[PDB]
Amino acid sequence: VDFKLSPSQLEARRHAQAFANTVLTKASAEYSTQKDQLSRFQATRPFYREAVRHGLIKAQVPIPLGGTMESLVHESIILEELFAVEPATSITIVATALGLMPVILCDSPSLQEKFLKPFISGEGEPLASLMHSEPNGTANWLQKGGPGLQTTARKVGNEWVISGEKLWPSNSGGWDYKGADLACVVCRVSDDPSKPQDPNVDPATQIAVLLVTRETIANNKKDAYQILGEPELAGHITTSGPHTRFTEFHVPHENLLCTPGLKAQGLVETAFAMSAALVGAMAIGTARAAFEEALVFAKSDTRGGSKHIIEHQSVADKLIDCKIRLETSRLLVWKAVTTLEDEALEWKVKLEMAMQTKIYTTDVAVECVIDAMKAVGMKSYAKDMSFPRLLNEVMCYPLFDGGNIGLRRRQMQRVMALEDYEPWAATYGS
Amino acid sequence: VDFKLSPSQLEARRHAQAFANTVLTKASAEYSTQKDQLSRFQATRPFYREAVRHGLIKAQVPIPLGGTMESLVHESIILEELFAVEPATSITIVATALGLMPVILCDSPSLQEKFLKPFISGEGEPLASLMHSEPNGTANWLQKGGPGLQTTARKVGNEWVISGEKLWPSNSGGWDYKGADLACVVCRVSDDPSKPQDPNVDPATQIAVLLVTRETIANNKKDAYQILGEPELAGHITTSGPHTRFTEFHVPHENLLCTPGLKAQGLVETAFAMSAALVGAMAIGTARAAFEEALVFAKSDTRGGSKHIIEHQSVADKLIDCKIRLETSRLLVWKAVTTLEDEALEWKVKLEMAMQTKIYTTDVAVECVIDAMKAVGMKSYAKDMSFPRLLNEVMCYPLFDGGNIGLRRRQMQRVMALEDYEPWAATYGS
Amino acid sequence: VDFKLSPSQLEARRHAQAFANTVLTKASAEYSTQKDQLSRFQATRPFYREAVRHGLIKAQVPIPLGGTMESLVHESIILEELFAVEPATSITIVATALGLMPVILCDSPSLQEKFLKPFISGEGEPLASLMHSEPNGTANWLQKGGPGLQTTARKVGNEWVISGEKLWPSNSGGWDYKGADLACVVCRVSDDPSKPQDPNVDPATQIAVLLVTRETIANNKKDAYQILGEPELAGHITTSGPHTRFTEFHVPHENLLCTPGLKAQGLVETAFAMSAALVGAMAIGTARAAFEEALVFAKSDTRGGSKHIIEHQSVADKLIDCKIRLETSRLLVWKAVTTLEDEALEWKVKLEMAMQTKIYTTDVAVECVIDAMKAVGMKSYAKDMSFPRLLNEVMCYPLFDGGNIGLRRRQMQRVMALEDYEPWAATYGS
Amino acid sequence: VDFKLSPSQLEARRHAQAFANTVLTKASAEYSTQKDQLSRFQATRPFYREAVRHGLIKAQVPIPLGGTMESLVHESIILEELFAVEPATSITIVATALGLMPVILCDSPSLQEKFLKPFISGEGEPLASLMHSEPNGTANWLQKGGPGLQTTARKVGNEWVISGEKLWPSNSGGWDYKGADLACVVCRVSDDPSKPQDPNVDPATQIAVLLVTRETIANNKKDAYQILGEPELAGHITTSGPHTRFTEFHVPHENLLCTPGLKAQGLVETAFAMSAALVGAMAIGTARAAFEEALVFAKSDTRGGSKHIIEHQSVADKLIDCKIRLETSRLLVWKAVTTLEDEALEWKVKLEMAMQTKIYTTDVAVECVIDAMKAVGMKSYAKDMSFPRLLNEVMCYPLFDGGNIGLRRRQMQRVMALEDYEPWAATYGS
Ligand SMILES: [C][C]([C]([C])[N+](=O)[O-])N1=C2C(=O)[N]C(=O)N=C2N([C][C]([O])[C]([O])[C]([O])[C]OP([O])(=O)OP([O])(=O)O[C][C]2O[C](N3[C]=NC4=C3N=[C]N=C4[N])[C]([O])[C]2[O])C2=[C]C([C])=C([C])[C]=C21
Ligand SMILES: [C][C]([C]([C])[N+](=O)[O-])N1=C2C(=O)[N]C(=O)N=C2N([C][C]([O])[C]([O])[C]([O])[C]OP([O])(=O)OP([O])(=O)O[C][C]2O[C](N3[C]=NC4=C3N=[C]N=C4[N])[C]([O])[C]2[O])C2=[C]C([C])=C([C])[C]=C21
Ligand SMILES: [C][C]([C]([C])[N+](=O)[O-])N1=C2C(=O)[N]C(=O)N=C2N([C][C]([O])[C]([O])[C]([O])[C]OP([O])(=O)OP([O])(=O)O[C][C]2O[C](N3[C]=NC4=C3N=[C]N=C4[N])[C]([O])[C]2[O])C2=[C]C([C])=C([C])[C]=C21
Ligand SMILES: [C][C]([C]([C])[N+](=O)[O-])N1=C2C(=O)[N]C(=O)N=C2N([C][C]([O])[C]([O])[C]([O])[C]OP([O])(=O)OP([O])(=O)O[C][C]2O[C](N3[C]=NC4=C3N=[C]N=C4[N])[C]([O])[C]2[O])C2=[C]C([C])=C([C])[C]=C21
Q1: Where are the active-site residues found (chains A, B, C, D)?
Q2: Facing residues of A251 across strands?
C-alpha cells in the first residue's frame, strides 16, 4: 500500500489552493454586506462563475461523460483545500455534484448527455440539486409501515404530477428562485396522496426520481412551483436550501431518471453514500483551518507568559488531539473513496465504509474546532479570528447530508445486522 | 444533608422567572435591529434599568452593606432562570456584580459606603466592572519571572498614575464609553513601565486595585482614558468589553482599594473564585434551554416516522446525557456556593471547589447543547430554533471568567500540589 | 440546601472506616490463597461475621422493623468507606441488603416480622439474596410479547411450584450451597412452564416473588434445588452468584411476598431502584481508592525527573478529572438517596433520579480508574499496586445491578417519554 | 494513494492466522497452570520455539541484513492476527524485535552480522531485549538538569563497566535468568555514578548503548548481574520484564553499539519510534477480538428479548463506535509504518506520525474493549468469555512502550514546537 500522491493529485491540490486563495478569499467582502440568506447566496454567483471557469464544475462529472473528474481522491483533496479557506461557493459546488450524481449513476446515455451538457460546457453558472429532504424529516423515509416521503408523484398520461414539499435541498431554487438548472426530485409514487402508504409494501419499491429543470418549471403554472421560505442557518450563511412546494407540478415522462422502484432508491442511496464519504473532506477542511490557526497562535503567542503557550502541556494536548483527529479523518476518507471505486467489492461493504467515514469525520471535526478554541482561549471568541465562523460551520457536518444519529448510524446498523456481514471485507477481502 | 429549597429561595426563582419572561423576552426585538456590539449593548439599557427597578442589582450587594443579597444559592437559582431565557442584560448584572465584589470584600467601610451607594439606591442604571483582562493575556499574570500585567500603576504625590491597556472587562466603558459608574482596575505597581517586571519579585506582592469612576475619568485629560475598540463576539452579542488604554491616568490615593500586594491580589482571586462558581449557573441556564427545547421536540415530533423520536434509543441516550450533565452541574454549583459561605473551611478548600465547578459545568454545558442539537437534527441548525444562539453563547463559558485550560485548571493544580492538600475537606470536614 | 453532615453521619463514616481498616484489610490474606470463586467467598465468612457483630447487617433494616438503619445517606457514606478499602464482604453486605428490601417494602407486618428476624438479631452470619437475574438475561423481562422470565411459579393446591434457572444472584446459595438464609425468587406465574408467555397479557401482571429459605430447600427433594455452576468473575473474586436450577421446587403459599402482579413487580422495581442509587457509593469508593493512590504517588514521585509529576500539567489534568468525577458522583448519590426518601415526590421522579445516578456514577468511575493509571504510568500495571484490582472491580458497576445500556437507560427513557414527565421535579418540586 | 494488499501481504496474514490457530491457541492450557510470571513465561518457550521454526523471528530482521522481513505493513498485519488470538509468545516476538532494532538500525555490517546471527539462523529460541526502562522511571531520561538514567557506564581500559538497575525490559533475563541471547543496555556515561549528572551538559550527548549477550554475562562475576524480581502484571501474564541490578558489570569495548552521544540516543529514539507504530497493531488485535466477540454475541443473542440485541440502537451504537476506532486505527498504523519507510521524509515527520499512532491506537483500543463489554452486558464479566483477559491486556498498551502521557505526547509536543514544524509533510510532502 502507498500514500504517495500522483503528479495529477499534487496538481489538483495546487490548483485548488490557488483558486480559493485568489478567488474565494474575496468572497466574504461581498456577501458579508448582505442582509439575508438568499442575498448572501446570490452574492456568491460571481465566485461560482469563476469556479466554473476554473473547471471545478466540469471536474464533478466523469470523463466518460464529457467531464474532467480524475477520481474521488482528487475530489477529496480539492474539497479539503477549499473548505480550509472558504466554504462559500465551495459548498455550492458539492451541492451541484450531489444533484448530478443520480444522472451520472443512471444507465441512460441519452438522459445523461441531455441533462449533464450545461455542466460540462464550462460556461455560465449551472446549478444542480438533489431534492430529497422534507419539512417533516426523512430519516424514516424508508421505514416499512411509515408515512413515507410526503412529496408524491403520480403518472397521468405521458407525464408525472408532483405534489408535496421539500426543505433543505441546496440550490434547489437556483440563483433567482425560478429553479436550479437541474434538480433530481425524489418522490414516493402515489395515485392518491390522501391515502397512507401501504404498511405491507417495501417503501423502497415506491421511490421515483423526476428530473426538473428551469424549462420544466416554466412550463407549469406559477402557483405549481413556489418557494415558501429560505432558512437562516447558523453557519454556511451563503448557502441556499429553500422550502419548496409542488402543487400539481407536471413533469414529462422523459424526465424520469429511471423505472420507479428499487432501481430509483438505489441511485439515491448510491449518491448519498458517495456524498457521505466526501463530506469528510469538508469536515477536515473546516477543522484543519481551526487547527492551523490555533497552532500558529500557540507557537507565536506567550499570552503574557515567558514562553509560547504551545510549551504548556495542556495546550499541546489539545493540539495533539486535533492533529490526530484530522490525520485519522483524512485517512478514513481516502480509504472510503478508494473503497467506493473498487468494483470487486460488494456494495454493502462500500456503504459501511462510507457510513463510518461520515459518522467519524463529522463528529471529531466539531471536537477539533472546540479544542482549538480552548487552546487559543478568550481571543478565539472574537470575530477578529476565524473561530467564530468555523464553529458555526463545523456544527453543520454532523447534522447534514444524513444526520449521524437518525440516518447514517441506522444504515450502518442495518448492514452489520445482516447474517453475511463481512467486517473487514474492505481491507482483507474475503 | 438536604436539598429542599426554603420559601425564600422558591420566591427568588419565581421572581427570576417572572422577570425573565416579562422583561428579558422583549430584549431580542430591541438589540436585534442594531448593527454593532456597542449599539446592541446600549439597546439593552432599558432592560437593565428594569432589572435595577426589580432590585436585581441591589441583590448583588450584601444586606450589611446596604444591599439585599440573601445567599449565593439564591443568586445561582436566579441566574439559572435568567440565562435559561435571555443572557442579555443578565450577563450585565453578573458583570456589575463582579466589579462590585472587590469593594464588597475589602475591609474599608469608608470606600464601601461611598462606592456602593449608587448600586443600592435602586435608581438609574449603575454599571460596575472589574478591569483585569488585558490584550496580551492574563493567564500568566502571576507568573514569577514573567512580564506580568501590562497595566501598571505608580505613586506620584498623593495620587496614582495608571499606564497600560485593558481588554474584555464587561461594561468597563459604561453606557456611553465615559466609564462605568464603578471600575476596579487591577494593576501591577511599577515606577517605570519602561523596564520589565523584576524577575526576583513575586508578582502577587505588587498587585494593586484602584477604583476608577466616571468622575475620575472626567478629572483626567480626554487622551488619558480612551476606548480603542469593541470586540465583535460570536455569542452574547449584547455585551460590552472594550479595549481601553490608560495614559498618565491620575487617580486619587483615596481610591486605593487596599494595601498593594497579597491583600489586593487576594481580593481579586476571591472575587473571581466566587464568580467562577456562579458561572456554572449561567452555563446550566443556557444548556437547560437547549435540553428542554430538544426534549419538547423529541416528544412531539416523529420526523416522518411512526413514533416520537424520543422512542429511539439513540435519541433518548442524548437526552439522558444532557439531563445528567445538567443535574450533576446544578448540584456542584450549589455545593460550591455553600462551601464558599462556610467560614469554617480554609480558603484553599473553597477555591478548589469553585474551580471544579467552573471547569465541569462550562465543559459539559457545551456537550449538552451539541448533543441536544444532534438529537433534534437538521432543524436545530435553523435560526427558527434557539440552538444557533445557544451554541454560540455556551461556547463562551469555557473560555471567559478565567479560561479552564490556562487559569482554572492551573489554580486547582496549584492547590492540589500543596503539602496540606485536603481532597475531601469540603465534604467530610478537615 | 445543606451539605453539612450531622454527628450521626460523621460517626457512621468513622465506624465504617474503623471496620474497614481493622477488619476488611485482613480479608485479602485469607481469600487470596483459595483457588476458586466459591472457596474465596467462603473464606470471607469469618469477615462477614464481624460485619454482623458491628451491626452492619442490622443497619440494613429500618428502625420501625427492628433494624438500626439511620438513613440512605448514612448507608451511602458507609459503603463509600467500605469499598474504598475492600469490596470483599462489603459486596456481601450490599447483596443481603438487596435481598431484604422486598420484604422490607412489602405491606405484610407478619411476613416482615418472621423473615427479618435473623437479620436484626446481630447473631451468626445470615445471608439474603434477591434472585432475579437469569441465564438468558433479564433486560427484557417485562417486554410484552417477549418470553419473559424463564423461572416460573405455578400455584398447585396450597403450594407454589418453581421451575427454571437463576444466574448471578449474589450469595443465593448461602455459604455451603444449601441456600441463602433468605431468598426472594422473582418468578413469572405460569400454569404450564412448557408453554410460552401469553403475548396478550402484560408481563408485569404475572410477576410473583416467592420467599425461599434453607428450610424450604430442606423440605424439597435433593435435586429440586441444585447449583450448576459458580461463575469466575474478572473482579469481586470473592462474591457468589451461582447458576441455580429449580425443578418442581415446592414453596409454601405463606412464603408469597405479596399478591402476584403489578404489586410484586412494583416491589422488585423499587428495590432495584434503591440499590441503583447506592451502587453509586460503591463506584465512588473504588474510584476514590484509585484517585487517592494516584494522587499520593503523583505528589511524592518525580519519575526520574526534577519535580513531582503532579507539577506536569498533563498529570494534573488527569487528577483534576478524577476529582471532578468523584465529586459530582457523591453529590448525585446523596441527592438520589435523599430524593428516594422524599414522601412528597411521585415515584416517577424518584426512579428517574435513581437511574441518572447509577448510569453516571458507574460510567464515570471506570474512567476515573483508567485516568488514575495513566497518570501513574507503567507502575500502575503491576500487582504491587492496587490498580490492577480496582480496574477489574470498577468494570463491574456499569454492568451489574441492572446494566446501564439494556436496563437503566431504558427505564429512564420510558419515564421521560411520559406525557406528564417533570424534568426538575426532584429539585424545584412540581 | 492505495490500500490494496499484495499477494505476499495476504499470504503473510494467512500464515499468521494459521500459526495463531494451530499453535498459539494451545498456549493457554500450558501457562494457565503455572503459579508465577516467570513460570508462565517459561511455559511459552515451546510456543516461541515454533514461532522460530515458522520463521517469525527471522521475519523481524530486514531482508538486506539476511532476515526475511518483507515490510512494516506485513509485520503490522502479522501482529494484528497474532494478538487477536493470543498475546502470549506474540508479545515475546515483539520484545525480541525491539531488542534487535538498535543493531538493525546501526551502520555497522560487522556488528549486525555478528549479533543478529542467532536470530536469523531459524533455530533454538533466541531472545532479544532493549533494556531501557528503570525503577525510577524514564519519562524524563533526557531532561536537561535532571537525574538522568540511573544505569550508568564508564570506560575502563579496553572495556566498559555498567552500574545500575533496569526494570521492565522484556525477556531481559532470558528463559533461565542467565540473560537474553542479545540485550541492548541503554546507559548514561558517567565516570562516577555516585555523582549527579552534569546539569550543564545535554543528557542526549551522554547516552551509550552496550550489547550484552549470555557470553558477556558468563564472563562476568555472578554478583555483577542478578535478577532482583519479576513483577506480576494485570495482563500479559506470560511476559518477563525482570528487575536487574548491574554491579561492576564488564562489557567489551567492541560490544559498544556506536559512539556515545546523539547517535546512540538516536538509535534508541528510532527503535522506540518504530515500536510505537507497531504497538498499534497489537492494540488493534486485542480490541478486534473484543469487538468480534461482542459482534457475534449481539447477532445471535436476544437476551430474553424478542430480537437479537444488535437490533437495539444503543447496542449498535457501541459496536459502530468500536468498528470505527478499529478502522481508523489500522489505517493510522499502515500510514505510520509506511511513513517510517519513506526515505524522502525527514525524521521529525516520521517521529510525529509514529507518536500520533501510539497515542491514538492505544487510547482508543481501551474504549473499544469497554464498549464491547457494556454491549454484551453481564456475561462479559465472566471468564467463560474472553473479555476479562482482553481488558487487562489492552490496558497495558497506553502505558507501555513509552506511556502516552509522559513520553509519547511530550515527544510529539517537542516536534510541534519546532519552528520548522511541517504538520502535513507526511501527506502532502514538504
Ligand atoms: C447535504 C446537502 C449538501 C448540498 N451536500 O451534499 O454537502 N444539502 C442537501 C441536499 O443537497 N439535498 C437534500 O435533499 N438535502 C440536503 N440537506 C438537508 C439535510 O441533508 C437533511 O435534512 C439531513 O441530513 C437529514 O435530516 P436529519 O436531521 O438527519 O433527519 P430528520 O428526519 O430531520 O431527524 C432528526 C433527528 O431525529 C432523530 N431520529 C429520527 N429518526 C430516527 C432518529 N433517531 C434514531 N432513529 C431514527 N429512525 C435523530 O436525532 C435525527 O437526527 C442539506 C442541508 C444543509 C444545511 C446544507 C448546507 C446542504 C444540504
Ligand atoms: C467574565 C466577565 C463577566 C462580566 N462575568 O464575570 O460573567 N467579563 C470580564 C470581566 O468582567 N472582567 C475582566 O477582567 N475580564 C472579563 N472577561 C475576559 C475573560 O474572562 C478573560 O480574558 C479570560 O477568562 C482569560 O483569558 P484566557 O484565555 O483564559 O487566558 P489567556 O491569557 O488569554 O490565555 C489563552 C490560552 O493560552 C493557554 N495558556 C496560557 N497560559 C497557560 C496556558 N495553558 C496552560 N498553562 C498556562 N500557564 C490556554 O489555552 C489559555 O486558554 C470577560 C469575557 C467575556 C467574553 C465576557 C462576556 C465577560 C467577561
Ligand atoms: C447486583 C447484585 C449485587 C448483590 N448488588 O446489589 O451490589 N447482584 C445481584 C443480585 O443480588 N441479584 C440479582 O438478581 N442479580 C445480581 N447480579 C446480576 C446483575 O445485576 C444482572 O445480571 C445485570 O444487572 C442484568 O444483566 P444486563 O447485562 O444488564 O442485561 P442482559 O439481559 O444480560 O443484557 C445484556 C446486554 O444486552 C443489551 N440489551 C439487552 N436488551 C436490551 C439491550 N440494550 C438495549 N435495549 C434492550 N432492550 C445491553 O447491551 C445489555 O447490557 C449481580 C451481578 C454481579 C456480578 C454481582 C457481583 C452482584 C450481583
Ligand atoms: C514495551 C516493551 C515490549 C517488549 N514491547 O516493545 O511491546 N517492554 C519493554 C522493553 O522491551 N524495554 C524497555 O526498556 N521497557 C519495556 N517496558 C517498560 C515500559 O515500556 C516503560 O516503563 C513505559 O512505557 C514508560 O514508563 P512511563 O509510565 O511512560 O514513564 P514513567 O517515567 O514511568 O512516568 C510515569 C508517569 O509519570 C507522569 N510523567 C512523568 N514524566 C512526565 C510525566 N508527565 C508529563 N510530563 C513528564 N515529563 C506521566 O503520567 C507518566 O505516565 C515494557 C513494559 C511492559 C508491561 C511490557 C509487557 C513490555 C515492555
Answers
A1: 401 (proton acceptor)
A2: A160
